[PDB]
């Protein structure tokens, strides 16, 4: 299978690669991480991953990364967001950018 | 509007006349069709459109691509190139080697809008008196789109809808089963089959649901996600 | 690793045997070539390889048929190579290529695949002077994330290698009337491209003297036209 | 009697229907033609809605060669007395009889032990009028149903027949004319334009049609030249 | 004497080259084979270097039919005294002679005046040993070069010959065997398996090759069955 991996901490978070690396243990991984619904411009930039899974830094939000992630890498079978440094339990789930990205994934059909 | 009509089943295919008839309702129709790669010679003889009104027509002893180039030179200029209605489907992986699709693509490569029409077969035959309403509705939709356009259309036998679709792309299993003919000679049965069912939104899915399928095609076969 | 080599010009094409000898530098090699959607019978007859002995079969069927039988009779197989076709397969030609379809069939069966072609008309491909570049190319593909589907066009005398995109061009449908030697009329169909191949395209790369390698897609959908059409408020 | 009608142009060929219609006026017809246009091989057919209702006869489009039609035809409508093949949109005169699909279906008939006849009408430029040819076809099918059976004839009907005529195959000699040329793109090639040394001589099928006469040539199966053996 | 050689398997078949080498023992040989109608058609042709280790052969690969090769060759090389065609991979016996491309090219040679012959060898199973067959092609060509010119013969050499024989075409009646069957998917279809009523007689080409004798059959162009005329 194929996997898209992102987070809301940025492309340098150890959490993100600790996730991409564990993700690659089950399929082709591609990483797209950060730097409204109306059409907005988004720029992504080739980024060297430190195994080796193709990657991008996206001058945009996490959602943007899932959208862009699929258009530049996809199709894809699964979206992974994290690992976020910091918990996301209880009432916190409501405003987590980490959860919002996985959510953007589900709403896209994955 | 001037419309060139062709196909790959032959000047004698009813599918071809069903389409020219339907196209006339939107403009002046011209027909050029096959009889049965580089600078080559081609023959073409006049042919009376069946009796329905009269359509200037020509049978070309060449390929559907030749028909398209021959129709634009014999009736040009042309606004639209329609190819079909093919007697057999042209969904998914089949689009790749479609003669019907080949003709339309040719028209596109010439700066014109084009579309291929196919109706699924191998069992019963299409009823074009019943398909006509759905054909007209489809052409009407196509002609509202921005030009030029390259669309692939498949119509089920008796339609109950319409969906803009994407191509069904599926993986297969190379089923090869040993066997011998009742006479004694051995051979291998090749029966490829998809690893899964067509997904919602794909052309294959739409048609199986009773809907007309319309897929906008791209000319570039390049996979940019593996190039960069 | 194990490799299946097929083509679409026939079991006697020297390009078929050049590809197999080159594929053998990287793995066990097996050959299944053509004699000339629904379940059909396919006859396959053992063929002696005219070089390091290659188990081979002559198939009475299509190249796609060869790939399927080749995987059954020689499984496991990790890579499917098609060619070397005597004749190019560039730009709009990819669509109808039999060589490409063989590789595409392999990809659809889950394997990694690549089609190889060289230009014809005039000088015949010199496979000795092409062996180095054939090898180099195979070594590179073998360093790609798998599976991959690639279209390779090697010029007659390669000076390099390049990842390319397909050349996509518009044409003016030139129809020139004429008459044969005995009087009968006809039309000369000869479409000319409205412009030169842009650099970065397969056509350009081969004209410059480079091996062209184009990663192919299986999806023909034009999503930039589809997606907006499918949108709502 | 029972008559199997086929062709090699396909189930939508106006010439196929003209011949079945013209045949049904001498017996029960059964159609089996290729929808597609020598060792056990799979072959499928599908009932096809025939366009003839005077009278209506069972039809089948076959995903196979003309020879497959004949075979599948005989198993589907067996036994059958006569196998007809045509009307071909195009001539099948002289050397053409060799690799003729139309003739081939009729031939395949004879080997299955039936009588057979290929029908063809020249074309190129103008299309035949099966409406006006019907008289001559009928007159032609009477003449054949008289013959000592089994028989194998190759009929050719001009566009507007003014008579009949049992004929012999035209067997001319050619000179291979070859002229160098170059397509619009400057590319060189050669025109291979073969042309006969003499004209068709009376009694030959090619002459008959040139005269406006329906030509019907009995054919032999054995290509062996017993003289030089 | 000059000799033109071709086939239908293509310029790369090793049978084309065995015949060409066997021919060279009797005169100058020229080759024109397919890289892979009667109206003037364009034909491309490109020089092609002969085998790397063997006598040098002037050759051309042509983008056309075997018949086209005969014509282009005659224009590019000829004057030619004989046209050879083969060695075809696979046989060309009995019924097959009609729809054979190999015979075809020879046949075209004849229609041009020149004498001509076609060579074929049974394939399917084990491939032919052209080194082991050389002595028989030489033997066969010796015999044909004695016949009065022009002539037209069809030759079939078994894999391991043990004699020669002047045959006549093996004609036979067949039965349209049609066994109903189904493939894996579960799809229905008809197995057409044509089968002859009785083994080939003797003195027939099919019979000889079965015994192990090379067969050679002189052919006629005229397909007319005079006795019914």
Q: Partners for E (CB, 8 Å, 3+ pairs)?
A: B, C, D
Residues with Cβ within 8 Å of residue D127, at least 6 apart in sequence: B47, B48, D89
Residue to mutate among D40, D41, D183, D195, with most C CBs inside 10 A, is D183
Tell the burial category of E131 from Cβ atoms under 10 Å away from its Cβ (0-12, 13-18, 19+). exposed
Residues with Cβ within 8 Å of residue E54, at least 6 apart in sequence: E17, E21
DSSP E64: S
Strands (E) located in D35-169 = 41-48, 59-63, 82-89, 115-121, 152-156
For the segment(s) E1-229, the CATH number from 3.40.1210.10, 3.50.50.60, 3.40.50.1700, 1.10.2020.10 is 3.40.1210.10
Q: What sign for the dihedral angle of Cα E200, D7, D99, E13?
A: negative
- Our answer on whether A and E touch (3+ beta-carbon pairs < 8 Å) is no
Residue D13: what are its φ and ψ, rounded to 5°?
Answer: -75, 120
Q: Are strands D2-6 and D28-31 parallel, antiparallel or unpaired?
A: parallel
Say which of E111, E169, E188 has its CB closest to residue D222: E169
Enter the tokens of residue D29: 């017809």
Backbone φ/ψ region at E86: left (φ over 0), alpha (ψ -120 to 50), beta: left
Which residue in B150, B135, B139, B11 sits closest to B67, CA to CA?
B11
From chain B, pick out residues whose CB is under 8 angstroms from the CB of A72: 225
CA angle C50, C55, C61 (to 5 degrees): 90
* B137 half-sphere exposure, CB direction, 13 A CA radius: 15
On whether the CB atoms of residues B42 and B66 are closer than 8 A, the answer is yes
Which residue in D157, D169, D154, D68 sits closest to D115, CA to CA?
D154
Residue A62: what are its φ and ψ, rounded to 5°?
Answer: -65, -45
Q: Cβ of B215 and C226 within 8 Å?
A: yes
DSSP string, E106-175: HHHHHHTSSEEEEEEE--SSS---HHHHHHHHHHHHHHHTTSPSS-EEEEE--SS-----B-B-----EE
Enter the tokens of residue C64: 């796609």
Exposure letters D46-73 (e unless 16+ CB within 10 A, then b): bebebeeeeeebebbbbbbbbbbbbbbb
Q: Cβ of C124 and E48 within 8 Å?
A: yes
| Cα–Cα dist B168/B197, whole Å | 10
* E124 half-sphere exposure, CB direction, 13 A CA radius: 10
On whether the CB atoms of residues E83 and E116 are closer than 8 A, the answer is yes
DSSP C124: P
Give D139 to chain C, closest Cα distance, Å: 35
On whether the CB atoms of residues C147 and C113 are closer than 8 A, the answer is yes
Which residue in A35, A91, C34, E222 sits closest to D217, CA to CA?
E222
Residues with Cβ within 8 Å of residue C109, at least 6 apart in sequence: B171, B172, B173, B174, C67, C68, C71, C80
Residues with Cβ within 8 Å of residue A88, at least 6 apart in sequence: A96, A98, A99
Spell out the CATH class of B1-228. Answer: alpha beta
Does residue C84 have a cis peptide bond before it, meaning omega lies within 30 degrees of 0?
Answer: yes
Residue D213: what are its φ and ψ, rounded to 5°?
Answer: -110, 140
Is residue B73 within 8 angstroms of chain C, CB to CB?
A: yes
On whether the CB atoms of residues D175 and D194 are closer than 8 A, the answer is yes
Q: Are strands E2-6 and E28-34 parallel, antiparallel or unpaired?
A: parallel
Is residue C38 within 8 angstroms of chain D, CB to CB?
A: no
Cross-strand pairs, D213: D163
Enter the tokens of residue C217: 């897609």
SS3 content of chain C, % helix, strand, coil (to 5): 25, 35, 40
Say which of E38, E40, E191 has its CB closest to residue D42: E191
Enter the tokens of residue D210: 């040139």
| Cα–Cα dist A4/A32, whole Å | 7
Contact residues of A toward B, CB < 8 A: 46, 72-74
Give the residue on E whose Cα is nearest the Cα of B181.
E191
From chain C, pick out residues whose CB is under 8 angstroms from the CB of D185: 190
For domain C1-233, the CATH superfamily is Survival protein SurE-like phosphatase/nucleotidase (3.40.1210.10)
Q: Cβ of E187 and C39 within 8 Å?
A: yes
Residue to mutate among C110, C174, C189, C212, with most B CBs inside 10 A, is C189
| Cα–Cα dist C214/C166, whole Å | 7
CA dihedral defined by B45, B51, B52, B58, rounded to 10 degrees? 0
On whether the CB atoms of residues D208 and D215 are closer than 8 A, the answer is yes
Q: Cβ of C108 and B93 within 8 Å?
A: yes
Enter the tokens of residue A76: 């894809």
Residue found by looking up tokens 């003449």 in the block: D143
| Cα–Cα dist B216/B145, whole Å | 11
| Cα–Cα dist E93/E217, whole Å | 10
On whether the CB atoms of residues E8 and E88 are closer than 8 A, the answer is yes
The rounded Cα C223 to chain-centroid distance in angstroms is: 26
Residue to mutate among C42, C173, C181, with most D CBs inside 10 A, is C181
Domain ranges of chain B: 1-228
CA angle C68, C73, C76 (to 5 degrees): 85
Give B190 to chain E, closest Cα distance, Å: 9
Cα distances (angstroms) measured from residue A105 to each of A16, A108, B198, D81, E64: 17, 5, 21, 70, 57
Enter the tokens of residue C75: 């499984």
Residues with Cβ within 8 Å of residue B90, at least 6 apart in sequence: B98, B100, B101, B116, B118, B152, B154
Annotated binding site of A for a divalent metal cation: 8-9, 84
Sheet holding B80-87, edge to edge: B44-46, B57-60, B28-34, B2-6, B80-87, B113-119, B150-154, B212-216, B162-164
Residue D81 assigned to a binding site = no
DSSP string, A60-95: S-HHHHHHHHHHHT---SEEEE---SS---GGGGGG
- For chain C, after which residues does the C atom lie more than 2.5 Å from the next written residue's N, i.e. where is it broken? 36, 50
| Three-state secondary structure call for residue B215 | strand
Say which of B42, B94, B173 has its CB closest to residue C187: B42
On whether the CB atoms of residues E76 and E31 are closer than 8 A, the answer is no
Residue found by looking up tokens 């097929």 in the block: C6
| Cα–Cα dist B1/B147, whole Å | 13
Reported structure resolution in angstroms: 2.6
Is residue C190 within 8 angstroms of chain D, CB to CB?
A: yes
Exposure letters B35-45 (e unless 16+ CB within 10 A, then b): beeebbbbbbe
| Cα–Cα dist D66/C53, whole Å | 42
On whether the CB atoms of residues E83 and E109 are closer than 8 A, the answer is yes
Enter the tokens of residue B200: 């919602």
| Cα–Cα dist B27/B188, whole Å | 51
Q: Cβ of D168 and E224 within 8 Å?
A: yes
On whether the CB atoms of residues D124 and D90 are closer than 8 A, the answer is yes
Is residue D55 within 8 angstroms of chain E, CB to CB?
A: no
Residue found by looking up tokens 């195959």 in the block: D169
């Amino acid at each position: 299978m194929r996997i898209l991996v992102t987070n809301d901490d940025g492309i340098y978070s150890p959490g993100l690669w600790a996730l991409a690396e564990a993700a690659s243990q089950f399929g082709e991984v591609f990483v797209a991480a950060p730097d409204i619904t109306i059409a907005h411009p988004v720029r992504a930039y080739p980024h060297p991953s430190p195994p080796h899974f193709p990657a991008y830094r996206v001058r945009g939000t996490p959602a943007d990364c899932v959208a862009l992630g699929l258009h530049l890498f996809g199709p894809v079978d699964l979206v992974l967001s994290g690992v976020n440094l910091g918990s996301n339990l209880g009432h916190e789930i409501w405003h987590s950018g980490t959860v919002a990205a996985a959510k953007q994934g589900y709403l896209f059909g994955l | 509007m001037r419309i060139l009509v062709t196909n790959d089943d032959g000047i004698y295919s009813p599918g071809l006349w069903a389409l020219a008839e339907a196209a006339s309702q939107f403009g002046e129709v011209f027909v050029a069709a096959p009889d049965t790669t580089i600078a080559h010679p081609v023959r073409a003889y006049p042919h009376p459109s069946p009796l329905a009104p009269h359509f200037p027509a020509y049978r070309v002893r060449g390929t559907p691509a030749d028909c398209v180039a021959l129709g634009l030179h014999l009736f040009g200029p042309v606004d639209l190139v329609l190819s079909g209605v093919n007697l057999g489907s042209n969904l998914g992986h089949e689009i790749w080697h479609s003669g019907t699709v080949a003709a339309a693509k040719q028209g596109y490569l010439f700066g014109l809008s084009a579309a291929a029409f196919s109706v699924p077969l191998n069992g019963e035959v299409p009823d074009f008196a019943g398909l006509r309403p759905w054909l007209l509705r489809t052409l009407e939709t196509l002609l509202r789109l921005e030009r030029p356009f390259l669309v692939n259309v498949n119509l089920p036998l008796r339609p109950k809808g319409f969906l803009w679709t994407r191509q069904s792309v599926r993986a297969y299993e190379g089923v090869v089963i040993p066997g011998e003919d009742p006479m004694g000679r051995p051979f291998y049965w090749f029966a490829p089959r998809p690893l899964k069912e067509a997904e919602e939104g794909t052309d294959r899915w739409a048609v199986a649901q009773g809907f007309v399928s319309a897929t906008p095609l791209r000319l570039d076969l390049t996979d940019e996600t593996r190039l960069q």
